[PDB]
Design a protein around this nucleic acid. Structure first.
Ligand SMILES: [Zn+2]
Lengths: 219, 89, 110, 131, 97
RNA sequence: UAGGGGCGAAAGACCAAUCGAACAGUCUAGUUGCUGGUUCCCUCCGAAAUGUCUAUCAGGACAGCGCGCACGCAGAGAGAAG
RNA sequence: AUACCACACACAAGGGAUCGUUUGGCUCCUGGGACGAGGAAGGGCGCAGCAGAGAGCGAUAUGUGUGGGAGCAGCAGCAAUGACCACACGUCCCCGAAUACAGCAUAGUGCUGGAGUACUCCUUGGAAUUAAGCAUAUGAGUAAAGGAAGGAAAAGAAACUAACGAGGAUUCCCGUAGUAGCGGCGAGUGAACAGGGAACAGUCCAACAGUGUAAUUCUCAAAUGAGAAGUUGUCAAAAGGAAGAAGAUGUGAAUCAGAAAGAAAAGCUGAACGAUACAGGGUGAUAGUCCCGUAGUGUCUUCUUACAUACGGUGAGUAGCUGUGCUCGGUAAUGCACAGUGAAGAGGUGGCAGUGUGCAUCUAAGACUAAAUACAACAGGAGACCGAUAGCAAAGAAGUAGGUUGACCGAAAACAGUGAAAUUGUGUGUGGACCCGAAUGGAUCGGGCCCGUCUUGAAACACGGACCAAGGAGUGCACAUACACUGCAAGUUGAGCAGAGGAAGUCUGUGAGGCGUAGUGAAGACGGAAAGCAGUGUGAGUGCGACCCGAUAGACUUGUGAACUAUA
């Protein structure tokens, strides 16, 4: 909308679009402001007042996270997401405390002993450059999802495992649905810490009782 | 007639180069510049926002203002021969 | 205008009207946290907040509810054996505009 | 992962920083690895290649060749090595430039300030290594 | 609508508190007395030096003829307030006596 | 001597190819009951150009005739016989 | 149809679509908010070995000092006697507030002027538009024009609310509320206290200064003197500190080889190794270990901040009143002015005019004040944004080339990639405008008027359309609503805000308000049926540019014009 423009009106054998007032340049007499014009203004310009976020009831958020946690212990769902678990003895996995690990070297040896080798390899081999214009806008590489580790108490193991591709970490008390159901499909593979697994009873309570940690919520 | 033949008589020139702004807009008979209002003390009111931004600070060189910012960054240190005067003051 | 509705009344006629968005909400929250933290170091052993009196709320609708007020009165402070200069040094708030009109309200603040 | 928020991870910003570099930052672009023996003779692991030094080409058309560095083009980041060339229709021969990182140093040119440059870097290490 | 359900009689009820008596401030110290005396004194000297204003003369003249209700109306129109008029009439009356 | 102003041996003439109210720029994307245009496939159902009120007669609103979702259900654009 | 016209296919022309790419734009967040008589901002002119534009710099037109260290892009010459870069300093032509000046203060030195003005304060003040016409009203105390200041500005410690069992400076957020009311009672307009929070801080002058001596400020001298201001009244006390924050910069792990194939391996295949570092960028195809970094760790430099005296209850052309004009939701006057008139020392107020009288609450006509709040230029970080007819007008010497008498107006052009259609030549085939149905070795047979659009009615002697590519029109927000889907249910809820957390996500508290749990009246007053609340979306109404394009006109400027033409 920058330019000085006006319509020539009828009687000149031309369409009555606004035109640019100028002289000495090829720009004289060209068609100015409308959406059907080169260099004109777009239809309904995009605007900051749009509603970016969305609400969801707290009671649904609580219930969805509870049944996402449940699905992490049904083999049919875990396999269905594409985690491969052929070599793993039993689900769920619960690592002890008194893990005294500090180095990545010894950290991987632990994970291999739980049967996770094929799963981890599946992640490392996956790295590829994205198709389309997203590769220009800071979203260049894509990787497959792998195990999530859940802890509750501060331990050295967290900074021993984190550089291994596809390993992900969160605390039990603030466990998110984006981490528990990626892409909106449920049944992510989870490594529990022994403290964290016991805490699930305080957090979600018992059937037909009220949780002390989540006020006003019952299963 | 008012078209082509009247164009032949157009050999006088009412505006010359202004000494304040350069813009070939000083009207000799009126004694006034149509771009910048010389000889009035203040500069003229510019007609619109588009036209005034074409002559703002930062459209030229800003020689003094740039040096001042660098000296302020450095803590106004002055000429190193004369440090004792600075320190006393 | 057609059909049955509550008759409109939407006030968007004024072309000089301003809009205020809230995209800064999470960031300004983080700044307020960081200012409190550093303020808390400057006076480390002492609480960041002062002690305030309990007063009774205003109208017939809120009579039965008690709330924090602005400051203790010279009479409350004196009755508890302190002096005004000392009270300030120990982090008690003072308000010399307030008046005492009940026995009960005085006894509780003491 | 990066936890410092003052450093950029934008593709657009990283690329501009590369090509518009000047001064000492430009010199960092001309670094090459030293061979295993030289990494015992001197403390350093890598140095900026200069004329007169002796290099093995480890990638490309001229792989396995050895020779003396003739010239260093800083604007178009390339090094010319003695005996790596192509012949035109005319029979005339043109030296083809190789990117620094495809080379490895075999013998160092010790003319001029090189011995002081090396000393300065060794000291900078030890200063913090021993602490 | 959660408005206008009680009658005016029941809205007038109140809780039985125990009150505190007001602390009277009647004592006036020696220095405060001299302060007030000097101000009242100064007000005498001004009246002695400069005399009465035109409407005060016209007012006092009406008081001698017992034109009480005329004087009242006159003073109301000059000062605006019926209270100020009642006060100024009483001060003028006392001056004449 | 400058724009609701000038200047006119008066024609509403002339004031930078513009004058029964100049040019530049902004308010402004002024308003429009009026003219023009309005971008993929198949399946199923399917109108109205009439009444009342209107500074109303090239426009509206309310009702009448379509379609969608349908709680439910003895009815019918035809005859007899009084 | 030998050669014309049309169509199909192959090759050569002609043009620049499409796909692949991007040292640019845009949006949000955080920091910053640094000019001038010591000559600014803006304009002109000069300076290179070969030098037009642009960049850099002033006749010192690549000088000095500090920290580094290898080349100067072409050609000729230079360079460890220091190429080039980074930090500071020195030098800095002419015009311009432009001043050998104007106004003004002190014992004296001096100060102001111009630039910028997004955000803040003070004046002045429209019309288009809506009311389906229009004059009060609306748009709007908005646009435009003037004055002024700072990193914020303004405001600020009650001549304040309230009628409770009361509270207690100012500013900001949630809310009371599209309510009480104002209004050709039409269109439309429209606040306050409460209740929940962020941040918190109070003080000065006058009234009112030692009289057994102006004890007070300044100048010159001197080691104790002279003089100026002032009795129309001067003079009312502390050093001091470690914390807190922002930058700059050093260091920083670990790989080799091969068949086939390619211009080139980093791919693929086997064997290893690092990780508190698998963020991201560069290398001749897709790299943790080839190069620059990153996680982790060192140093250094700046900036911010902190103890003393004496006091109260009368601040005048003011408050108020009469008339008048503007203004506000303020209504028998909410605020502000002008003219007449004009107080008391005791006065002001308690949303409806007056008079009286108790009661409650305050103290005007002098001043200062932090934090929590707003937003350009310039710098830094991010993104479900745009990808060269897009995104800023501008991805190159863009406010440029160029243009107006003037105010002012204003383009195109990416890769030495790919290489579509319109349109042209040559060769080879098939037809005489072309489409649909059905066929021959071969003459052809039957059916079809030109599309889009308003219209009772178009093949029309109704209008738009020469041809091809690319662009090109029901969208966003607020408020009620009916339907479909989801959780809980006499209840329900992501208000703001706090606590946790390598964090614009998520989890947990505290805790208002709103609507519902039953209605009737103008009201006093009375009381007796019917599941709701909050979301995710769809159809539809109203207001904002409101599906896209289009008037003749109206207003406003401290903007321009008598080079053509009129008259002195
Ligand atoms: Zn000028």
């Amino acid at each position: 909308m920058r330019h000085s423009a006006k319509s020539w009106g009828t009687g000149r054998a031309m369409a009555r679009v606004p035109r640019v007032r100028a002289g000495g340049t090829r720009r004289a007499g060209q068609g100015a402001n409308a959406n059907f014009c080169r260099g004109g203004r777009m239809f309904a310009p995009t605007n900051v007042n749009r509603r970016w976020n969305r609400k969801t009831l707290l009671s649904i958020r609580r219930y969805a996270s509870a049944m996402a946690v449940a699905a992490t212990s049904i083999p049919a769902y875990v396999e269905g997401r594409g985690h491969r678990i052929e070599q793993i003895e039993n689900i769920p996995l619960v690592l002890s405390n008194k893990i005294d690990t500090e180095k990545t070297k010894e950290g991987i040896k632990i994970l291999y002993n739980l049967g996770l080798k094929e799963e981890l390899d599946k992640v490392e081999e996956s790295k590829n450059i994205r198709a389309g214009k997203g590769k220009w806008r800071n979203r260049r590489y894509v990787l497959k999802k792998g195990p999530l580790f859940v802890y509750t108490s501060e331990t050295s193991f967290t900074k021993a495992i984190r550089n291994i591709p596809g390993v992900d970490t969160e605390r039990v008390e603030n466990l998110s649905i984006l981490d528990l159901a990626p892409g909106g499909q449920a049944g992510r593979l989870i490594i529990w810490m022994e403290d964290a697994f016991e805490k699930l009873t305080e957090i979600y309570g018992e059937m037909n009782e009220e949780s002390k940690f989540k006020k006003g919520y019952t299963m | 007639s008012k078209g082509t033949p009247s164009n032949g008589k157009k050999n006088k020139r009412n505006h010359t180069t202004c000494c304040r702004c350069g813009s070939v807009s000083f009207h000799k008979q009126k004694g006034k510049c149509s771009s910048c209002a010389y000889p009035e003390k203040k500069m003229k009111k510019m007609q619109n926002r588009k036209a005034m931004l074409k002559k703002t600070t930062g459209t030229g060189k800003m020689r003094h203002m740039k040096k001042e910012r660098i000296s302020r960054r450095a803590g106004y240190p002055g000429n190193p021969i004369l440090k004792e005067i600075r320190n006393k003051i | 205008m057609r059909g049955n509705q509550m008759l409109p009344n939407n006030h968007f006629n004024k072309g000089s009207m301003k809009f205020k968005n809230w995209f800064n909400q999470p960031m300004r929250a983080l700044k307020r946290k960081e200012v409190r933290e550093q303020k808390s170091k400057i006076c480390y052993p002492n609480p960041l907040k002062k002690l305030r009196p309990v007063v009774r709320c205003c109208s017939m609708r809120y009579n039965k509810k008690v709330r924090l007020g602005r400051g203790f009165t010279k009479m409350e402070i004196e009755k508890a054996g302190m002096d005004i200069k000392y009270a300030i040094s120990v982090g008690i708030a003072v308000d010399l505009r307030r008046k005492n009109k009940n026995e009960e309200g005085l006894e509780e603040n003491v | 992962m990066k936890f410092n928020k003052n450093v950029t991870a934008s593709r657009r910003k990283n690329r501009k920083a590369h090509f518009t570099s000047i001064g000492l930052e430009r010199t960092k672009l001309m670094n090459a690895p030293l061979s295993k023996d030289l990494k015992e003779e001197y403390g350093i692991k890598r140095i900026a290649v200069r004329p007169g030094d002796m290099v093995k080409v480890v990638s490309g058309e001229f792989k396995k060749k050895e020779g003396v560095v003739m010239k260093v083009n800083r604007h178009d980041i390339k090094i010319e090595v003695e005996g790596c060339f192509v012949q035109k229709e005319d029979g005339k021969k043109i030296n083809k430039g190789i990117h620094p990182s495809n080379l490895r140093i075999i013998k160092l040119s010790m003319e001029k300030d090189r011995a002081e440059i090396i000393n300065k870097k060794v000291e900078a290490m030890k200063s913090e290594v021993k602490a | 609508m959660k408005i206008n359900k009680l009658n005016n009689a029941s809205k007038a009820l109140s809780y039985p508190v125990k009150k505190l008596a007001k602390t009277e401030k009647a004592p006036l110290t020696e220095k405060q007395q001299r302060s007030k005396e000097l101000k009242k004194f100064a007000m005498s000297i001004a009246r002695e030096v400069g005399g009465l204003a035109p409407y005060e003369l016209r007012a006092t003249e009406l008081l001698r003829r017992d034109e009480d209700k005329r004087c009242k109306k006159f003073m109301k129109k000059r000062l605006g307030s019926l209270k100020m008029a009642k006060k100024k009439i009483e001060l003028l009356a006392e001056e004449m006596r």
